[PDB]
Design a protein around this ligand. Structure first.
Ligand SMILES: O=C1CCc2cc(C(=O)O)c(F)cc2N1
Ligand SMILES: O=C1CCc2cc(C(=O)O)c(F)cc2N1
Lengths: 280, 281, 275, 280
């Protein structure tokens, strides 16, 4: 029965991640929609039309978001961040907790820009994913130089309401991006392909999408609720000589495992290239 | 609640992974008391047989006892035992029984051929389910046989819906479902092991990497199930231009990721047909 | 107290006799072995070990209680004809020849005496250091003590368990051919150690020790091999980098391919036996 | 023998390797569990749970481990080493033998850090693996600038109680890491896949794991006990036209040998990359 009575949340950016989090927070009951405000330079986005139905306050002016908010999410593209922080930097107060979800934007770069206006800005770096929209996100966060102990606990409380959330060291966020940030896209790709396979073997497309999604959801839930190794759970499904062990062999023959390792690695490395442009 | 007060007796011929998964699921659902379940196995030293004991499921080495106890009888053995099994307990199948075959590839026609030699109208249902019934998130399909009453199919759907998704299909779809959701959880466990390796390669502790990858898959599956959206649209929606995610998608494409999962569904389906081509011939 | 014979005096005959005598279960002089080409190195090796040697297969039969068939499979028919009239009630015939079915042996021997006691066994060369992997299947007329006796004899030179005969082709692909896969892998690992600067001899020793220690860890753990893999792979470390390059090559699938190919070939040989 | 009467051993780090060595040492009889002390900054590790049950005295203060030890194993990740050498570098005494088991951490770098406190730190670099836990490890060590003759002898004796052990030049340690350090992980991968193959061909999983593990163990022991080349052993067991030579062909067709060469090389090269971060 969680609810933040004295918290006002702002989003700079009204893209997919801002909508997902606002929808998750409101569905979770931790935050009334009208105590949330978001700002975007494009008031004709599909997400902007959706936020208005929820009752989120919308404004085109970032300073308006900053002046309304206590917790301020930065959910914009990384190249705009230096211009955003210049724009609202003079408007950051002691009460503000700045939570950056911008891709590869480091705590150092945000604190350096904001400290030019006011010392000790309270900064938290967040890496979350879109399944927060169904309250099954995976979120990690790292606390900045000046964030109080209570700032991180508060952020963990809020982000726990929309999925898994834990604190990490900041130099793990690139790797988490490659795993759970990009993970949902890997799964959507897998689900489309599995459904194609279902259709090839004779299933209606709709049924094949449903079954494949249910299979993935159930397997993930099994693992989360098991203490056992994913290899052990795989062993339990694969009856000797059966259909499943035959299909696993053709996965192995294509290097299935290595493609997913490749993917995690490529997403993490790209995130570091973006962290470099942030720090350069 | 309705099924519970039916006070249904359930039997499993076969006490393996799937029998344990379903027994665990049904009891967790509250639809069945563990001691109203009976399971038989030719081998009592299995680990699944021991977990079944601890649950309080009744265990016996005698298939006839499982049959006589049961109202709904699950057949959960390898496809090549089924003719031996139906020969053994075919005389004991009563008009009141619903026979539910889970044995992969085994056709309704083959079961009814054996059982029709004893009672004339055996009630047979063919089922294809998976191991996540154990956490009540299974994916189940079933096809009703020649003599299954309309109420038999509804009862089956109600029972299997308590542990996951369940819907009726025509029987000629079941081998393809086997390739998709029957074998699906194993594809996912393989993917999760690999994603965790990738997380560990890039600096995460194994424990956290397992947790994050599993949470990622779960939330993405839930997202798809709750949206009317095409999975490619969801993929589009989350891949920002120039971003880390689209870079990772490219390397998946470059290895033919999609084709491997199609290959897998196809190989599992074809294998199931090969096992049915020894059930029939 | 028991007398053991070997029709055949090759790699598998020597490995078993060396294993048994090293184990203290059999005295070298209570073992006899027969061979045509009495000029194999393994023949001269059994000689130095104390095993009695004869060129006449019938003499081995007359000497033995338990009679191992360690010949190539194309020789089994020509052998069951030669000695089939010399099999007695007391004999346990243990076939180790590749893909030779219990059916084919009992059918040939039943033409001489009903109820021949036949056991089919699939073992491997590491019995020579008492770390073999053995499975056996009992025939139609094998008494209970026959299989119990077999398990006691073979357990002295490694792991041993009973299986249904229709699992033996798969076991061949796994533990029957497995030592060859490990020898190939050890040669390759040593090549990699030498490329990175190690002397060959140290590289062979280190690679073999690593494989021995890993195998023992798994046997002595209750844990899944993937779990042990997780335990050794430090985040960001050298091991997880090396596992990625194995995965990129389809390493796992090649070993699956191997077990499958060896099993399938064994089945092809069982076919020519069953005709 | 007398090397071990009244010897105390300490571990800084309670990860996988400190448990493996502690379990192996106590099972060997060379040390008593109570005479072993370990320091971990997080009692949440699963290994820290087991170490306590062994009777190994645990503590969070690394300085306590240093005070209580004669032979000091450093079993942490390589990037904490500069932090840990700064923490207890003043507590290193002439009596200490400092044994580094941190990946890629060079003797030069440890001696550089500790030479700023007392002038002649006794340092040994060690490369062991996890099968020390069943006393079948493969260990090599390199002796540093100030290690006495008895120091190498004592290390050899200690590590010989849990497996193979020999002295190498330090510049072979990266190559050994790639071979016997990563080796057990190659074997676990191979065993999982060999079991998958046995399962595909009809075997129960449990029997397939047992049989594959027994085959590998027996083959390795066979090679250790023969004077013969691994290729000659391969020849001896491959009968003409038989099942084994058919299986070897499909291994060759996938470049099986080259993958394992690739693996040793990749692990060695990564160790060199870590060695460079130790000297930067
Ligand atoms: O309900 C069922 C039937 C038995 C079954 C067998 C396999 C197999 O691997 O052969 C499977 F993948 C899924 C199932 N699920
Ligand atoms: O002694 C030691 C500690 C350093 C080390 C690191 C790895 C790794 O690659 O993660 C390894 F496999 C073995 C060792 N051996």
């Amino acid at each position: 029965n969680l609810y933040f009575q004295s918290m006002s949340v702002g989003f700079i950016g009204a893209g997919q991640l801002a909508f997902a989090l606002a929808k998750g927070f409101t569905a979770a009951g931790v935050l009334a929609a009208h105590k949330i405000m978001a700002s975007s330079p494009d008031m004709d986005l599909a997400t902007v039309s959706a936020l208005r139905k929820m009752g989120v306050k919308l404004t085109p002016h970032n300073k308006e978001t900053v002046q309304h908010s206590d917790v301020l999410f930065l959910a914009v593209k990384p190249h705009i961040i230096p211009f955003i922080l210049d724009e609202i930097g003079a408007d950051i107060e002691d009460r503000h907790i700045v939570v950056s979800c911008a891709a590869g934007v480091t705590i150092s770069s945000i604190e350096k820009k904001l400290s030019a206006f006011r010392p000790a800005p309270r900064v938290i770096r967040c890496m979350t994913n879109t399944p927060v929209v169904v309250r099954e996100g995976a979120t990690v966060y790292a606390t900045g130089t000046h964030a109080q102990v209570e700032d991180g606990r508060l952020m963990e409380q809020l982000l726990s309401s929309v999925g898994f959330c834990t604190e990490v060291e900041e130099d793990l966020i690139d790797a988490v991006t490659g795993l759970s940030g990009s993970g949902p896209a890997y799964a959507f790709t897998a689900l489309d392909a599995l459904a194609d396979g279902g259709v090839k073997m004779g299933l209606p497309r709709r049924l094949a999408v449903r079954l494949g999604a249910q299979a993935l959801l159930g397997a993930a839930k099994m693992l989360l609720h098991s203490e056992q190794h994913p290899g052990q759970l795989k062993d339990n499904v694969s009856s000797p000589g059966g259909a499943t062990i035959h299909a696993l062999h053709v996965l192995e023959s294509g290097g299935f495992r290595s493609l997913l390792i490749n993917a995690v690695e490529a997403s993490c490395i790209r995130t570091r290239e973006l962290q470099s442009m942030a720090d350069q």
